[PDB]
Amino acid sequence: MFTTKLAEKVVSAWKAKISQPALKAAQDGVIDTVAAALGGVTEHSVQVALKYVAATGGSGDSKLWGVNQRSNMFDAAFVNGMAAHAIDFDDSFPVMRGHPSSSLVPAIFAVGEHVGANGHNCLKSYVLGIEVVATLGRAVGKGHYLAGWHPTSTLGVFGATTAAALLLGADEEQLRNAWGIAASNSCGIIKNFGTMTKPMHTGSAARNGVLSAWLSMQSFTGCQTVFDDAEGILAMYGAQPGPELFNAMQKFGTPWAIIAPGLYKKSWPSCYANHKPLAGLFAIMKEHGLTGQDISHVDVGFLPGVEKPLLYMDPRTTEEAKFSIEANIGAALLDGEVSLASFEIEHLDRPAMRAAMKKVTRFDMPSETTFSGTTGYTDIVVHTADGKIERRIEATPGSLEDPMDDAHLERKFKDCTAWMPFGESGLLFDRLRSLTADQGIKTVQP
Amino acid sequence: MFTTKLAEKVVSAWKAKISQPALKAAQDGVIDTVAAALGGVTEHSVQVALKYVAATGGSGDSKLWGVNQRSNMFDAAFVNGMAAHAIDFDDSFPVMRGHPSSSLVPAIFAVGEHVGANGHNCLKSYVLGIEVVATLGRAVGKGHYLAGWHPTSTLGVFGATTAAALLLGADEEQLRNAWGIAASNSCGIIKNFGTMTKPMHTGSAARNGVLSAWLSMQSFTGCQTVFDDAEGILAMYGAQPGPELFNAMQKFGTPWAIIAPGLYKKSWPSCYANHKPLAGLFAIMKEHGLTGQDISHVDVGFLPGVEKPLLYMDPRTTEEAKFSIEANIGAALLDGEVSLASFEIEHLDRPAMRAAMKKVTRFDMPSETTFSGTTGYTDIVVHTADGKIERRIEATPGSLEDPMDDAHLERKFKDCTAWMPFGESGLLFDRLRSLTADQGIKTVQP
């Protein structure tokens, strides 16, 4: 009954009004995700995605973000989902231990443009796709990520499917069906972190979410109970029989997970496991009046489960650097900031950068439970002329405890779109903000 | 380590000649797979796949089987993969516990047509794709299927990737890269059996295999050690990482797995778990001179692990019936045969068919280990007016112990293509066989 109940909750909510705060949360998620995408459109991964579109000989009217080109909705969702994750700057969501918006927002744009949808419905579909992935993440728990799966795509695909299906006009049956199709297209592994395959996870999840929904509307069948039982995808991913499943569903919309705990907005284009350490380092530098020239070493601690994604101690590519605490803290020490340019290959290969990276060491922080990059707390030690400065960082930057405010999000957008021609970034920012006023999503044209 | 050693073996074999029996085995595989596809091109799943192609606006020179249409190689692989598996009449491969040819052969035609490949290289790519999937199958063991995944696609994607890569000109590095990409596109679950999503598994695997290969040739990166260690996909699927992995590839090409145990060709369009039961029933009917009217009941036994895919005792769709021993034995009883028309919805819905299905029941056969529909043995009991006939069926139809010979494979092709315009089936049969003569694959045009 879990799958049936979830589709009832989603479709019933779809037919009802949704709160101003939820729509505002969704609006901000859109702006952050498009910023993240536009900051990454020159990456090789996205350029190759564009080449793929050329190779398909395909055509259509869904906008490929950052370029004056359109294609069919499936391939647009692929390209834009790739772009949304290309520099690891898009949001996280601790309930899922992953990045839901880099599949969901691309899917919503691709389908929304196709069907001529307006902003309230688009935003509502985001709210509901996030509620679905929150419910599934709660069901699955911590084991799925620890076992080597990337929940970003393995669970993200269901978010994308949900919003696509709703926009396409799915009823409960069609929605249940679409989730069944998606479950057989649920994939992505952690060993591909530090490669271009990581943004493919979200490209594929967006495309597959759109495709799964569209197929469902064509009377193409899949399992309508795919979340249920030992044979269902949740159990396969480690959901335990008992109350976990019942606990998960009890949340629904009271409050919406897009509000609480909400989407965590990244201050730096790198793995969240870097971010409490960076916050702490910068706070120490500011408070004590230290530059990196005044710091001889930094020790960065990690709770159980947190270090997993940071695969590279000596990263050699732009992608690897985002999964290196050495590169993150190294750049912070060298430049006094971490920016879009920090992980560009020319910056990464500076002799001075490689020197700074050698100032950084990792250590284990003891605990009886496991945590993630967006949860728990971090201990750092900053070594200086006058001794060691110890600090515990309790708030994750971007969480409700250290939220990104309007001014911060606007500056992120600006920085990610600095390459756009005169005036075009501001105009796009304004159009993005008009979704709240029920403007046609096709008018936005990121 | 395992991944690098496997790519070395594949590329070394690629550059060498392969034996005639390997070539023949590949040739027969192509013919069986195209037969199976051409028998299923009218299924709603394929019809929807063709609607998808129309929706993409895609174009190219990869032919779509059974229709006068061509598209790009990715979408042709998708459509023809869907078609190859649409009525469950394609081959099985015990070492993988799945259907490798329904992703491999579509990928080979799509890529081969694109690059103007000749028959010997096409057939060689098939042999090597099969050798890779045999290797991975041996490494993962029995647990993966039993845990709810469909090895047909989860492992089959690597077959398709290997062949596509080789045809596109991959070296070792690019092959290793392609596997990495493909590993994040490994998916498909058993709970979708009896729905249109099952043949999507093979369409998706074929397309993803072609895409992973293509992407690798564009310097799009994935993990180059993706089958190694606990973090690799084989361990994730239950293999024992470390040195023990190399036992999986100790006799690579000696003999080729495409020869021993070989591809198992189906005599009936349904799950293999139905097939020893049917062979037994027909033998008893023939030996004892019994028609279905002479038989009041049939008991069908299943060793541990074997019954798993037969999800439906009361199938209500064409797809469900293929996963129902009741439907299979029912149709055998009523008509004295099982054919392509047996599982069409009008035949399934016959009151006399529904009555015959009620004569069938299932039972467990004891063992300390688990088996599959292409291994072990089957006990059946046929009930007649005089008493009960028990029979143990030791050989799986299509295995080396009960192989499909040339005359039978040609008959299967004929039956699957009888709808074609007058003379075209034979013309196509001859063109398919021209691959053995190193003709250009582009001439074949299924």
XYZ file of N, CA and C in Angstrom, chain A residues 44-46 48-49 51-52 55-60 71-72 74-75 78 82 147-149 180-181 183-192 194-201 204 207-208 211-212 214-215 218-223 225-233 236-237 308 319, chain B residues 44-46 48-49 51-52 55-60 71-72 74-75 78 82 147-149 177 180-181 183-192 194-197 199-201 204 207-208 211-212 214-215 218-223 225-233 236-237 308 319:
408
model
N 33.887 20.386 -19.933
C 33.941 19.404 -21.012
C 32.724 18.485 -21.032
N 32.243 18.137 -19.846
C 31.140 17.224 -19.723
C 29.926 17.797 -20.469
N 29.665 19.072 -20.264
C 28.499 19.718 -20.913
C 28.760 19.930 -22.410
N 30.442 18.023 -24.329
C 30.237 16.700 -24.927
C 28.748 16.362 -25.018
N 27.991 16.733 -23.988
C 26.515 16.616 -24.047
C 25.895 17.350 -25.219
N 27.505 17.935 -27.992
C 27.933 17.162 -29.164
C 27.011 15.958 -29.392
N 26.549 15.379 -28.287
C 25.602 14.298 -28.328
C 24.305 14.752 -28.983
N 24.846 14.888 -32.580
C 24.895 13.507 -33.061
C 23.544 12.818 -33.173
N 22.576 13.196 -32.354
C 21.238 12.592 -32.442
C 20.504 13.048 -33.704
N 20.905 14.202 -34.230
C 20.155 14.816 -35.307
C 18.761 15.213 -34.865
N 18.581 15.389 -33.556
C 17.289 15.622 -32.948
C 16.910 17.089 -32.954
N 15.638 17.364 -32.668
C 15.132 18.720 -32.717
C 13.906 18.865 -31.832
N 13.623 20.099 -31.460
C 12.479 20.383 -30.669
C 12.606 21.785 -30.121
N 16.240 21.547 -28.134
C 16.003 20.207 -28.644
C 14.733 19.621 -28.051
N 14.544 18.332 -28.268
C 13.425 17.646 -27.677
C 13.598 17.629 -26.169
N 13.475 15.359 -23.909
C 14.269 14.307 -23.266
C 15.737 14.711 -23.269
N 16.238 15.117 -24.444
C 17.652 15.508 -24.538
C 17.954 16.831 -23.841
N 18.515 15.980 -20.379
C 19.870 15.365 -20.233
C 20.966 16.437 -20.161
N 22.974 17.497 -16.767
C 24.439 17.456 -16.802
C 25.019 18.814 -16.365
N 26.979 2.078 0.856
C 27.177 0.862 0.079
C 27.683 1.140 -1.324
N 27.767 2.418 -1.680
C 28.431 2.833 -2.893
C 27.547 3.417 -3.963
N 26.258 3.544 -3.672
C 25.284 4.142 -4.597
C 25.236 5.635 -4.450
N 7.231 2.990 -11.441
C 7.686 1.659 -11.810
C 8.704 1.672 -12.932
N 8.437 2.434 -13.981
C 9.356 2.535 -15.120
C 10.675 3.127 -14.622
N 12.004 3.123 -11.704
C 12.773 2.237 -10.807
C 13.732 1.317 -11.542
N 13.387 0.973 -12.773
C 14.272 0.140 -13.587
C 15.329 1.003 -14.309
N 15.323 2.310 -14.044
C 16.277 3.220 -14.632
C 16.947 4.025 -13.519
N 17.051 3.409 -12.345
C 17.620 4.017 -11.163
C 19.062 3.523 -11.082
N 20.019 4.438 -11.157
C 21.422 4.031 -11.239
C 22.363 5.146 -10.795
N 23.667 4.845 -10.796
C 24.707 5.794 -10.418
C 25.525 5.357 -9.219
N 26.846 5.305 -9.387
C 27.723 4.860 -8.292
C 28.750 5.893 -7.870
N 29.136 5.814 -6.600
C 30.111 6.752 -6.021
C 31.525 6.619 -6.602
N 31.887 5.459 -7.122
C 33.266 5.311 -7.629
C 33.524 6.206 -8.841
N 32.463 6.702 -9.490
C 32.599 7.668 -10.570
C 32.731 9.128 -10.172
N 34.630 12.401 -9.236
C 35.931 12.884 -9.712
C 36.119 12.606 -11.187
N 35.031 12.208 -11.856
C 35.026 12.012 -13.275
C 33.787 12.738 -13.824
N 33.758 12.869 -15.142
C 32.597 13.508 -15.798
C 31.309 12.679 -15.715
N 31.441 11.417 -15.352
C 30.274 10.558 -15.168
C 29.376 11.036 -14.014
N 29.938 11.715 -13.003
C 29.110 12.199 -11.880
C 27.990 13.145 -12.368
N 28.318 14.216 -13.128
C 27.181 14.987 -13.701
C 26.294 14.236 -14.666
N 26.811 13.214 -15.343
C 25.926 12.352 -16.142
C 24.805 11.731 -15.289
N 25.098 11.438 -14.017
C 24.102 10.820 -13.118
C 22.810 11.656 -13.157
N 21.200 11.921 -16.776
C 20.466 10.691 -17.015
C 19.189 10.606 -16.178
N 16.652 13.028 -17.704
C 16.113 12.457 -18.939
C 15.219 11.274 -18.659
N 15.707 10.380 -17.804
C 14.956 9.190 -17.459
C 13.686 9.519 -16.708
N 11.361 10.737 -19.505
C 10.998 9.587 -20.332
C 10.020 8.656 -19.631
N 10.265 8.384 -18.357
C 9.402 7.501 -17.558
C 7.996 8.065 -17.466
N 6.588 10.346 -19.584
C 6.001 10.373 -20.936
C 5.501 8.972 -21.331
N 6.327 7.953 -21.069
C 5.976 6.591 -21.403
C 4.669 6.194 -20.736
N 1.611 7.094 -22.376
C 1.363 6.370 -23.636
C 0.845 4.970 -23.340
N 0.422 4.701 -22.106
C -0.029 3.358 -21.739
C 1.093 2.329 -21.811
N 2.323 2.787 -21.596
C 3.485 1.922 -21.461
C 3.592 1.562 -19.994
N 3.571 0.264 -19.687
C 3.382 -0.200 -18.323
C 4.668 -0.456 -17.550
N 4.583 -0.254 -16.248
C 5.587 -0.677 -15.303
C 4.867 -1.058 -14.014
N 5.628 -1.579 -13.084
C 5.096 -2.029 -11.789
C 4.464 -0.846 -11.069
N 3.494 -0.945 -7.881
C 3.743 -1.117 -6.449
C 5.248 -1.189 -6.208
N 5.998 -0.394 -6.963
C 7.426 -0.612 -7.053
C 8.237 -0.250 -5.807
N 7.661 0.578 -4.942
C 8.262 0.895 -3.631
C 7.951 -0.140 -2.561
N 7.040 -1.077 -2.841
C 6.495 -1.972 -1.795
C 7.255 -3.283 -1.739
N 7.390 -3.838 -0.540
C 7.846 -5.211 -0.330
C 9.327 -5.462 -0.628
N 9.762 -6.686 -0.324
C 11.150 -7.090 -0.470
C 11.614 -6.957 -1.911
N 10.690 -7.198 -2.839
C 10.954 -7.111 -4.278
C 11.015 -5.672 -4.813
N 10.518 -4.728 -4.034
C 10.470 -3.330 -4.434
C 11.841 -2.671 -4.333
N 11.986 -1.528 -5.001
C 13.269 -0.855 -5.079
C 13.780 -0.332 -3.723
N 15.347 -3.219 -1.858
C 16.577 -3.529 -2.554
C 17.720 -2.606 -2.160
N 17.397 -1.336 -1.987
C 18.319 -0.300 -1.502
C 18.461 -0.230 0.049
N 33.868 9.771 3.033
C 33.705 8.833 1.914
C 33.918 9.444 0.513
N 37.754 17.846 -11.978
C 36.724 17.058 -11.293
C 37.206 16.458 -9.993
N 2.971 -3.350 -28.098
C 2.749 -1.953 -27.708
C 4.040 -1.301 -27.229
N 4.895 -2.066 -26.562
C 6.189 -1.526 -26.114
C 7.012 -0.964 -27.279
N 7.096 -1.713 -28.374
C 7.857 -1.263 -29.555
C 7.146 -0.110 -30.252
N 5.333 2.111 -28.918
C 5.643 3.312 -28.108
C 7.083 3.791 -28.306
N 8.026 2.852 -28.365
C 9.431 3.205 -28.741
C 9.544 3.912 -30.077
N 7.130 5.738 -31.317
C 6.535 7.061 -31.052
C 7.584 7.961 -30.395
N 8.389 7.378 -29.513
C 9.485 8.106 -28.872
C 10.447 8.644 -29.936
N 9.066 11.554 -31.486
C 9.179 12.676 -30.538
C 10.570 13.306 -30.421
N 11.622 12.521 -30.591
C 12.966 13.054 -30.521
C 13.314 13.944 -31.714
N 12.676 13.681 -32.852
C 13.068 14.275 -34.117
C 14.385 13.724 -34.645
N 14.862 12.606 -34.076
C 16.201 12.083 -34.374
C 16.358 11.626 -35.816
N 17.592 11.644 -36.319
C 17.891 11.153 -37.652
C 19.274 10.528 -37.687
N 19.478 9.629 -38.646
C 20.745 8.938 -38.786
C 20.640 7.807 -39.785
N 17.331 5.965 -37.757
C 17.580 7.087 -36.851
C 19.038 7.121 -36.464
N 19.361 7.934 -35.464
C 20.702 7.910 -34.900
C 20.978 6.576 -34.207
N 21.988 5.779 -31.223
C 21.543 5.633 -29.837
C 20.077 5.209 -29.775
N 19.239 5.921 -30.508
C 17.820 5.608 -30.532
C 17.475 4.335 -31.324
N 18.101 1.667 -28.857
C 17.005 1.640 -27.928
C 15.829 0.883 -28.522
N 14.543 -2.890 -27.422
C 13.201 -3.097 -26.948
C 12.564 -4.240 -27.771
N 18.679 -11.083 -5.369
C 18.443 -9.860 -4.615
C 17.469 -8.893 -5.307
N 17.046 -9.210 -6.523
C 15.985 -8.448 -7.174
C 16.431 -7.703 -8.428
N 17.711 -7.779 -8.772
C 18.184 -7.100 -10.003
C 18.094 -7.971 -11.248
N 37.447 3.352 -19.694
C 36.660 4.537 -19.466
C 35.162 4.283 -19.745
N 33.439 2.369 -17.083
C 33.192 3.236 -15.940
C 31.888 3.971 -16.121
N 31.744 4.593 -17.270
C 30.512 5.326 -17.607
C 29.322 4.376 -17.523
N 28.923 1.657 -15.906
C 28.606 1.207 -14.559
C 27.641 2.099 -13.767
N 27.631 3.382 -14.085
C 26.666 4.322 -13.507
C 25.349 4.327 -14.286
N 25.249 3.473 -15.304
C 24.040 3.298 -16.109
C 23.599 1.827 -16.113
N 23.952 1.123 -15.035
C 23.615 -0.276 -14.822
C 22.386 -0.327 -13.932
N 21.300 -0.889 -14.456
C 20.017 -0.800 -13.787
C 19.049 -1.841 -14.322
N 17.868 -1.907 -13.709
C 16.838 -2.843 -14.116
C 16.498 -3.841 -13.021
N 15.228 -3.929 -12.657
C 14.785 -4.815 -11.567
C 13.726 -5.857 -11.981
N 13.735 -6.990 -11.293
C 12.814 -8.096 -11.561
C 11.341 -7.754 -11.308
N 11.054 -6.812 -10.404
C 9.647 -6.498 -10.094
C 8.894 -5.936 -11.293
N 9.633 -5.425 -12.271
C 9.030 -4.994 -13.529
C 8.778 -6.091 -14.584
N 6.768 -8.871 -16.437
C 5.331 -8.875 -16.755
C 4.724 -7.522 -17.066
N 5.583 -6.530 -17.338
C 5.203 -5.197 -17.787
C 6.075 -4.843 -18.988
N 5.730 -3.761 -19.674
C 6.508 -3.320 -20.844
C 7.901 -2.800 -20.510
N 8.150 -2.584 -19.225
C 9.434 -2.098 -18.736
C 10.523 -3.174 -18.840
N 11.239 -5.288 -21.482
C 12.031 -5.018 -22.708
C 12.687 -3.636 -22.734
N 12.174 -2.648 -21.992
C 12.919 -1.384 -21.852
C 14.301 -1.642 -21.246
N 14.409 -2.639 -20.390
C 15.733 -2.968 -19.796
C 16.795 -3.126 -20.900
N 17.290 0.095 -23.071
C 18.110 1.058 -22.294
C 19.560 0.604 -22.215
N 21.178 1.169 -25.802
C 21.447 2.594 -25.952
C 22.549 3.106 -25.028
N 22.496 2.712 -23.775
C 23.486 3.145 -22.797
C 24.845 2.572 -23.084
N 26.019 4.707 -25.979
C 26.324 6.033 -25.463
C 27.621 6.047 -24.628
N 27.766 5.087 -23.732
C 28.972 5.009 -22.894
C 30.218 4.905 -23.791
N 30.463 5.838 -27.033
C 30.605 7.052 -27.808
C 31.244 8.132 -26.949
N 30.716 8.277 -25.732
C 31.205 9.278 -24.778
C 32.676 9.074 -24.486
N 34.952 10.614 -26.899
C 34.949 12.083 -26.827
C 35.772 12.606 -25.648
N 36.526 11.715 -25.009
C 37.351 12.083 -23.877
C 36.478 12.484 -22.674
N 35.267 11.932 -22.641
C 34.377 12.021 -21.493
C 34.771 10.924 -20.520
N 35.060 11.305 -19.274
C 35.712 10.397 -18.355
C 34.748 9.658 -17.424
N 35.100 8.412 -17.135
C 34.531 7.620 -16.097
C 35.674 6.900 -15.410
N 35.347 6.237 -14.308
C 36.308 5.460 -13.529
C 36.923 4.355 -14.394
N 38.822 1.862 -13.237
C 38.998 0.680 -12.397
C 37.658 0.226 -11.828
N 36.603 0.348 -12.635
C 35.266 0.302 -12.081
C 34.835 -1.095 -11.594
N 35.490 -2.165 -12.074
C 35.178 -3.513 -11.613
C 36.047 -3.906 -10.388
N 36.977 -3.042 -9.978
C 37.898 -3.385 -8.879
C 37.416 -2.955 -7.492
N 37.826 -3.717 -6.478
C 37.689 -3.335 -5.060
C 36.243 -3.221 -4.544
N 36.105 -2.966 -3.240
C 34.789 -2.893 -2.601
C 33.913 -1.817 -3.209
N 34.540 -0.733 -3.667
C 33.818 0.438 -4.220
C 33.328 0.199 -5.673
N 33.912 -0.779 -6.347
C 33.529 -1.166 -7.714
C 32.183 -1.863 -7.822
N 31.659 -1.894 -9.031
C 30.267 -2.298 -9.228
C 30.082 -3.800 -9.006
N 29.775 -4.293 -5.308
C 28.465 -3.743 -4.989
C 27.359 -4.730 -5.316
N 27.518 -5.459 -6.420
C 26.568 -6.507 -6.792
C 26.806 -7.891 -6.141
N 11.378 -17.805 -9.159
C 11.353 -16.362 -8.853
C 10.692 -15.479 -9.915
N 1.981 -9.628 -21.414
C 3.313 -9.635 -20.799
C 3.325 -10.515 -19.573
